[PDB]
From Swiss-Prot, chains A, B:
Organism lineage: Eukaryota, Metazoa, Chordata, Craniata, Vertebrata
Pfam families reported for this sequence: GST_C (PF00043), GST_N (PF02798)
Modification sites for N6-succinyllysine: 3
GO annotation, cellular component aspect: cytosol
Subcellular localization, as worded in the UniProt entry: Cytoplasm
Binding annotation for glutathione: 8, 44, 53-54, 66-67
Oxidoreductase among keywords: yes
Keyword field: Acetylation, Cytoplasm, Isomerase, Lipid metabolism, Oxidoreductase, Peroxidase, Transferase
Gene Ontology molecular-function annotations: dinitrosyl-iron complex binding; fatty acid binding; glutathione binding; glutathione peroxidase activity; glutathione transferase activity; protein homodimerization activity; steroid Delta-isomerase activity
Residues covered by the GST N-terminal domain: 2-82
Quaternary assembly: Homodimer. Homodimer or heterodimer of GSTA1 and GSTA2.
Gene3D superfamilies tied to this protein: 1.20.1050.10, Glutaredoxin (3.40.30.10)
Family named by the database record: Belongs to the GST superfamily. Alpha family.
Name used for this protein in its record: Glutathione S-transferase alpha-1
Amino acid sequence: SGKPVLHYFNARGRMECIRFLLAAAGVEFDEKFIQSPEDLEKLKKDGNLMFDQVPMVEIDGMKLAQTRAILNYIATKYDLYGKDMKERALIDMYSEGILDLTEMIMQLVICPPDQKEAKTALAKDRTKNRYLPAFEKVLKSHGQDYLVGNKLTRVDIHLLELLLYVEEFDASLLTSFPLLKAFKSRISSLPNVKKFLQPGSQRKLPMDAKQIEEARKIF
Amino acid sequence: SGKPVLHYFNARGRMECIRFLLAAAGVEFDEKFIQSPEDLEKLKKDGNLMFDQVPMVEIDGMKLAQTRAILNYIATKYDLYGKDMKERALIDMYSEGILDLTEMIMQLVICPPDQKEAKTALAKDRTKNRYLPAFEKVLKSHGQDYLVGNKLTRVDIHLLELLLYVEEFDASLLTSFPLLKAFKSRISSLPNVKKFLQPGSQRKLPMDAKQIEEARKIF
Ligand SMILES: N[C@@H](CCC(=O)N[C@@H](CS(=O)(=O)O)C(=O)NCC(=O)O)C(=O)O
Ligand SMILES: N[C@@H](CCC(=O)N[C@@H](CS(=O)(=O)O)C(=O)NCC(=O)O)C(=O)O
């Protein structure tokens, strides 16, 4: 089989979603954490990062970089990419909006302190008046347990991850989304997911303060 | 067949790549240009933008939003997405780095004037010391006319588009990349592409000044 090698900083960043996807597929993986600028330079020196950047996953003989390229690949091979040409349109259109808000939130602990409060208000607004209603809409439309195809797919995992971050951001934002709430429980309960959520796994912690400082050396 | 409907501002923005892809596939499309905040509000009011945003293409009965979702869909249906599960890894990993630099350049005519010169220097550096060598590497590795699978795919089109923007940015940056140069000629010469490049097509003009101002009302 071969255990994929993920290269990244000891942080969620962009690799987090990849970690989540792999674990959900029940595929064990090895990681090499970039801990020093040296590590990174050495990494680049090897000529294995197509654009001198990470994420980069060694898998099936490829040195696949680019978050979406990696995820996309993993999704197909582990049948987490739906049944056909239209389901993926849905999955695709559902994952990107999920990526959007994710970044939106990320920014919060990265922006000029002078403007945090305002960005946060926007993020909350967006979260509850744009994103959540959208996904909730999707669930309410078919009443089935999975977002697409009534079969587990990558967005289900992606949605879970986002919901977990929204819960870390402002938990009250999720209290008016029943099906989403229920969804979170369901997906979280999946054996693979549960294991990953259990402490002692490759899931990385949220950043800020402690992590903000460590970023101020390499990330 | 049905002619897809693309909703967007009268600008390249994020839809440009979609326009390029469609034309390359020889698929005619209709567009409804967002010309007034009203237009946009009305557009949103209809409840057809999953996240209240555009790009959004009506196609095959879907109101598909999300740039990458749309492109991805178009690529598969018009067989511009390679032969298999590994070629797309390549295509994927090649399109995103192409999207990266694109945005990088975009920023130039959007950043605080105080810092343009510096960002531009970085963009030029990146262009010629990171991106171009990468794609050039890909071409030099197999000597065939297409980047992947020796068959025309979406990245070929995406690469062309980027090269055209790099040519608009700083043409001298392309003079040390033979195969890229040749590639540009080849792809540009493709009947579908040529037509699109010919004036009087749906290809949008670059922004700034004239366009900067018009953005200051809606975009
Ligand atoms: N589009 C890339 C972005 C990757 C990226 O920006 N990588 C950064 C690090 S981080 O922002 O993700 O932390 C990097 O490797 N930068 C190092 C370099 O470019 O030399 C992706 O999604 O994979
Ligand atoms: N991730 C989306 C981004 C789309 C986006 O940001 N759309 C903006 C307009 S633009 O930045 O592309 O010009 C929008 O519709 N904003 C209106 C709104 O959000 O209400 C995509 O790639 O499709």
